[PDB]
Design a protein around this ligand. Sequence first.
Ligand code: YHR
Ligand code: LDP
Lengths: 382, 385
Amino acid sequence: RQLVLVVVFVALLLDNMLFTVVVPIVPTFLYDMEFQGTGFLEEEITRVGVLFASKAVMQLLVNPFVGPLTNRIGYHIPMFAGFVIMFLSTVMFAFSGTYTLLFVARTLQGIGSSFSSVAGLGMLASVYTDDHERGRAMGTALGGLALGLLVGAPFGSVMYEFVGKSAPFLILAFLALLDGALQLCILAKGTPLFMLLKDPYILVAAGSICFANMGVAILEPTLPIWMMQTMCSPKWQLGLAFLPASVSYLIGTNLFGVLANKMGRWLCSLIGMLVVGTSLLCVPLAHNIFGLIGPNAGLGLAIGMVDSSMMPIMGHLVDLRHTSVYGSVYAIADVAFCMGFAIGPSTGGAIVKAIGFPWLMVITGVINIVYAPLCYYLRSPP
Amino acid sequence: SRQLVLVVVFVALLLDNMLFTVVVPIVPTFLYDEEITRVGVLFASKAVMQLLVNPFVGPLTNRIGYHIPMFAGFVIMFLSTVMFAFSGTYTLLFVARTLQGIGSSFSSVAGLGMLASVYTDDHERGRAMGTALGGLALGLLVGAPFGSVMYEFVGKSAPFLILAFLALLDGALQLCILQPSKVSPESAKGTPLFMLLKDPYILVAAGSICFANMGVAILEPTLPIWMMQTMCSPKWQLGLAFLPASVSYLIGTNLFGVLANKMGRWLCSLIGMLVVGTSLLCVPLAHNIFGLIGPNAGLGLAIGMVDSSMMPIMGHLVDLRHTSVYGSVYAIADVAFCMGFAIGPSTGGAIVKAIGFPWLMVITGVINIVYAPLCYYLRSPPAKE
Ligand SMILES: COC(=O)[C@H]1[C@H]2C[C@@H]3c4[nH]c5cc(OC)ccc5c4CCN3C[C@H]2C[C@@H](OC(=O)c2cc(OC)c(OC)c(OC)c2)[C@@H]1OC
Ligand SMILES: NCCc1ccc(O)c(O)c1
């Protein structure tokens, strides 16, 4: 039972590290091939946004098909697919030389990520039947996701200007190959998601999570381009500037998971959304790298507060009114992240092409601040 | 000197706002020997008419200076206190409030104008107005229990006589330092008032102060009626309920008058809006008296933050674009103050009977929260050509 936990942790870690490691490398890779430096990425922001939203679009498309596929052919065969398609994606990323190959790698990564996320969690649920170690296993997997998010950003940024461009992808490929060998030596219906989104409260919670995550979603594809255009930071600090967004996130989720039950979940979500908006407003004001330490850390702490205050309310709402499954909250919450990462990067390129960069953060801040009073609905649902 | 001028404004706002809260626990008790509406409109008389006199006081200060309007405010305040000490009828307890409102408008406009004129540096100007607002908070905090104990032990005419004596001391001080004996016209021709509402930044700041003061002022006349309906609390706790609001307002204005220049005016006003909105949202959820300590303290801190942030910003904008005459913009700010304090008490019971107190708090918090993002516009207004 420990081996399956190890392989699931490794797979989620690899997926999160790949997702975080593409962000430092793609803008600098595009800039290096064509020609601090000259500014011409304003035309390419829209294609960068489409490339970043490709994985979210593919995951949303392939999500409902993965459901009944596992019942027919078990869980090992589609879990085996995630490792191999992630291998093809990480191999294509290292050897990609044109924009078209990166798109194929992104969609292939999205398909593999969806398959692995369904299959590994299903295998974890099937393996543990004691009704108490399942929660610990899920918490360990989520901590692995957090660790991958923490460690992915310094990976590519540090080892692009130092040890080459293809270096950070073959290490991930070797790690994925290690995961495949580990899993190779191996061995109640719940109101479906299409009907769970028909009540106002769960929809409000999902919208709150999506609008909280949309700030980071629009911060990812457009921040390095702004950095090279304005602050003249070196190429090894673009991924260094995103450490607070994960460190403060983990600190906030720990602290507010400990202390949100006493002072109210909806109040925690409200203040988290409000400081998300304030941090997004304060982000475009910095004129150096050190100016981003404050607003980014605040945004990460706020998003951690919002998640820690919104997941238990979603679980309670699903349990009280509908029938819950072991991973019921996973489906609704994953759709919020998927919808955010699908609508953020795509619309952000057009927004930054039409108007300036800071207006996007102003728009997102007013959107978060406006949606924040809507959290009054969630206190004591009937 | 420039230090004694702030001493006069500190005493002037201390006594003028002292008369505002002293009449609260002595006036309704006297008339008892539909009644709520009659008592309610008596309290709102000062707020209703100080709005009207304000547009005639702003431009008037350009041609005669600041000393004479504040001396006139002292004279009218003394007349109001002597009328309060003797009158014992509803019809005579109305012209006194009229005179109190007129004197309050004169004193507030003249004091803020002179504080803006003497204190030129923005960072230095951000502390004098903070200490003036702290003095106003001190007056509003100390007015009610003083009048209550004076009526309880010595009688009705005693506290108004003591206020008259303190007003005479303040007038002697004003004659000592300010020297209100001649009319001095300002050399610079100030901009007309009807052009100062044609720019968005002054309108945004005025709306900020107005919305924060609505959020504070609507709660006072409506809170005890809801408390007696749901909480079932004794009479003496009604005055103690709003003590944390005044204490937190004083502490917040004193601290953020220093902190506003360092941390930022727009961020301070923004956070004050969010704090006051969340406090108004969380107010109607308490099930006992102890549950109102937190939200009320946060509400008072938010009011102090908004007031301290938006006081020097008006003079900052006027210096940035228009000519250096500060009477009109602070007249607009006092208009926002008084209109917020006037709309509340006269219509609070009607709105509570119409839609309900919790819904009213929900709308007020929602308007404050939505108007909070609009304070980003005052980050850096462009200057004049
Ligand atoms: C990227 O990959 C993700 O998408 C993860 C994160 C998304 C987002 C993010 N991206 C960044 C990229 C950066 O570099 C540029 C820097 C900072 C950030 C931040 C800071 C903010 N941050 C939040 C991250 C959250 C992760 O998801 C969960 O941890 C989770 C938790 C749960 O409860 C405990 C769940 O319920 C059981 C659950 O299932 C639905 C999932 C989420 O998916 C796995
Ligand atoms: N601008 C006044 C703000 C205020 C704060 C506390 C009070 O009790 C009050 O009556 C008024």
